[PDB]
C-alpha cells in the first residue's frame, strides 16, 4: 500500500501469534515493542531516543507479519510509549519513502 | 525522490537561512531541530519519546525547504540528538510510505 502521513502510520502486526498495533517509524533504527512475553532467549540491551536511554530485551530472529508482509528479525521489548516498527523490519517488507 | 531505508533517511533541509541534515521521521508528529538561535516569538513545550520528555521551544510559521520542496510550519527547538522532520512538514511535501 501507499500510506499518507496526515495521521500516525499505525498498522496491525502479528507477533508470537498475537495481534498488536504498531507505528511505521522511519526514524527508528530498531523495532521496539511495549512489554510483552516473546519466546526464546533474549539479551539485555540499551537504546536511545529523544528523551534519553532505556533498557530493553533483545530478541533475535523473530517472525513478524506487518500488514500481511513477512519479516523475521530483531525485536526489542521495553518501556517505549508506542510499539514501533523500525528500519530493520521496514527494509524487509520493501518499504520506501517517496515524495 | 524515492528514499530507501537501508540507512537513516537523512536529507538536506534549509531553515532560517541555514542548510542542515535532517532525518525524515514518520514516527514523529512534530519537527524537532537541534539547538539553534532562530529569531521570533516562541512558547515552551514538552515532547516525549523513548527515554522520556525533553523541553523545547515552539516556533510557528517557519519556512523549511526539504530537498527543494517548500514547507512552512511549526518547528520545535531543543536538545534533540538529531534534526527530525516530522509529519507536520512531511505531509506538506507529499511524502508517503510505500510497500
Amino acid at each position: 500500500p501507499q500510506i499518507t502521513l496526515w495521521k500516525r502510520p499505525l498498522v496491525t502486526i502479528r507477533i508470537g501469534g498475537q495481534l498488536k498495533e504498531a507505528l511505521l517509524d522511519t526514524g527508528a533504527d530498531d523495532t521496539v515493542l511495549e512489554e510483552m512475553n516473546l519466546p526464546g532467549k533474549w539479551k539485555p540491551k540499551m537504546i536511545g531516543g529523544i528523551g534519553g536511554f532505556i533498557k530493553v530485551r533483545q530478541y533475535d530472529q523473530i517472525p513478524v507479519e506487518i500488514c500481511g508482509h513477512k519479516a523475521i528479525g530483531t525485536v526489542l521489548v521495553g518501556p517505549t510509549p508506542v510499539n514501533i516498527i523500525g528500519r530493520n523490519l521496514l527494509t524487509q517488507i520493501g518499504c520506501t519513502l517517496n515524495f | 525522490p524515492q528514499i530507501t531505508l537501508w540507512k537513516r533517511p537523512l536529507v538536506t533541509i534549509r531553515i532560517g537561512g541555514q542548510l542542515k541534515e535532517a532525518l525524515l521521521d514518520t514516527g514523529a508528529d512534530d519537527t524537532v531541530l537541534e539547538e539553534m538561535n532562530l529569531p521570533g516569538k516562541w512558547k515552551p513545550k514538552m515532547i516525549g519519546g523513548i527515554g522520556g520528555f525533553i523541553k523545547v521551544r515552539q516556533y510557528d510559521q517557519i519556512p523549511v525547504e526539504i530537498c527543494g520542496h517548500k514547507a512552512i510550519g511549526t518547528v520545535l527547538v531543543g536538545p534533540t540528538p538529531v534534526n527530525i522532520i516530522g509529519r507536520n512538514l512531511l505531509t506538506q511535501i507529499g511524502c508517503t510510505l510505500n510497500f
Partner: peptide, 4 residues
C-alpha cells in the same frame, strides 16, 4: 541504537 537510535529510536526517534
Amino acid at each position: 541504537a537510535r529510536v526517534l
